Amino acid sequence: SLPDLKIEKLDEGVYVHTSFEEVNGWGVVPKHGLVVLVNAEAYLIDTPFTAKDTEKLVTWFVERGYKIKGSISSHFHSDSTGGIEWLNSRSIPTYASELTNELLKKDGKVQATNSFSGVNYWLVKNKIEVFYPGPGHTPDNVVVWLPERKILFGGCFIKPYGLGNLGDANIEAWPKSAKLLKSKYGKAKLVVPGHSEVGDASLLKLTLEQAVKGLNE
Ligand SMILES: [Zn+2]
Ligand SMILES: [Zn+2]
């Protein structure tokens, strides 16, 4: 019996959703995503692990007068993509990078309906920016920038306390990717990691340090 899905307002037009998975390796793991409001429309930044929690998340927003316009998954792991099957089945548009969709296809997983490539991709012009810093936590990890609030969703790329599971990681590339990310979004007010507490721009520096330290060893 996992903890309940949580939805908490972070800032004007921005909510953090927290869902939980059981893992023999630590135990129960929280995963943070966002919901971003754009004029009575809602965008999912990462899905919960499960169809059920994705449905609970959509319904919470639909019952408050928001149309779910889309989801974007920051990387191929189930903690960002677990909801894509359900969203596709409800004809809610799903987004992931060409790299993410290729990794989903390789692993026998259902793909996002819409894909993008390049360093920069606007999901919503001037409101929701996707940035590819390069390989790190996974080959495909992207971040999501909300320029109006200076909020960065770093997702599972942001690892200020330790790099965690290296199974899909590029330890050689991560320091370069993290250097690029810190340069691009050094002015971030809020950085939202995948698996630890919301913080300021310092999580970018801490991530860089862990990536450097991880490569050295
Ligand atoms: Zn991951
Ligand atoms: Zn993760």
Side-chain angles (χ1 to χ4, degrees):
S1 59
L2 292 158
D4 285 350
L5 176 71
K6 251 184 312 192
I7 308 169
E8 307 186 12
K9 194 173 158 158
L10 177 55
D11 199 352
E12 186 193 309
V14 184
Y15 294 76
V16 176
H17 64 83
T18 310
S19 59
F20 303 81
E21 71 167 347
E22 185 60 51
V23 164
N24 285 235
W26 209 108
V28 172
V29 165
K31 170 64 175 49
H32 304 302
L34 302 181
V35 181
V36 177
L37 301 187
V38 186
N39 293 149
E41 285 169 338
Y43 288 87
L44 270 48
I45 315 298
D46 278 14
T47 73
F49 300 87
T50 59
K52 283 184 173 165
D53 278 355
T54 299
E55 186 281 330
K56 286 175 89 185
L57 183 58
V58 159
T59 292
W60 196 91
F61 280 94
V62 162
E63 284 179 0
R64 276 158 189 74
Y66 304 104
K67 166 90 248 84
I68 312 308
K69 271 295 286 172
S71 73
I72 174 133
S73 296
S74 59
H75 72 320
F76 81 104
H77 285 163
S78 50
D79 69 349
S80 299
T81 60
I84 283 175
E85 281 191 34
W86 188 85
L87 291 170
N88 289 3
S89 88
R90 305 284 294 116
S91 306
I92 297 164
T94 58
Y95 296 76
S97 80
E98 256 188 22
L99 292 193
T100 291
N101 263 355
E102 188 282 322
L103 284 155
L104 287 173
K105 179 165 193 189
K106 247 195 253 170
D107 267 6
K109 303 298 176 186
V110 166
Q111 294 169 241
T113 305
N114 306 274
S115 55
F116 57 85
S117 57
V119 172
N120 315 108
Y121 175 77
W122 289 104
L123 184 67
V124 178
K125 230 307 222 312
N126 311 128
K127 287 157 193 312
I128 306 180
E129 183 177 64
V130 191
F131 184 73
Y132 183 53
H137 168 62
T138 55
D140 59 321
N141 45 30
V142 296
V143 305
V144 176
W145 172 240
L146 314 187
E148 290 194 350
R149 308 268 92 246
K150 303 177 196 309
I151 299 171
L152 183 69
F153 182 67
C156 302
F157 185 91
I158 298 296
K159 284 296 168 62
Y161 310 141
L163 298 178
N165 162 53
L166 301 174
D168 293 320
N170 187 328
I171 203 77
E172 290 90 11
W174 204 334
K176 190 188 192 197
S177 311
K179 167 162 189 216
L180 192 60
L181 189 67
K182 182 175 179 285
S183 283
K184 175 81 172 180
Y185 298 119
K187 64 268 176 55
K189 152 158 66 67
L190 296 179
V191 177
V192 177
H195 298 287
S196 60
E197 225 133 348
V198 173
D200 61 9
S202 78
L203 301 192
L204 295 176
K205 180 190 178 72
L206 292 176
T207 296
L208 173 53
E209 294 174 0
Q210 290 289 345
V212 171
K213 193 201 169 190
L215 177 55
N216 285 349
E217 306 170 5

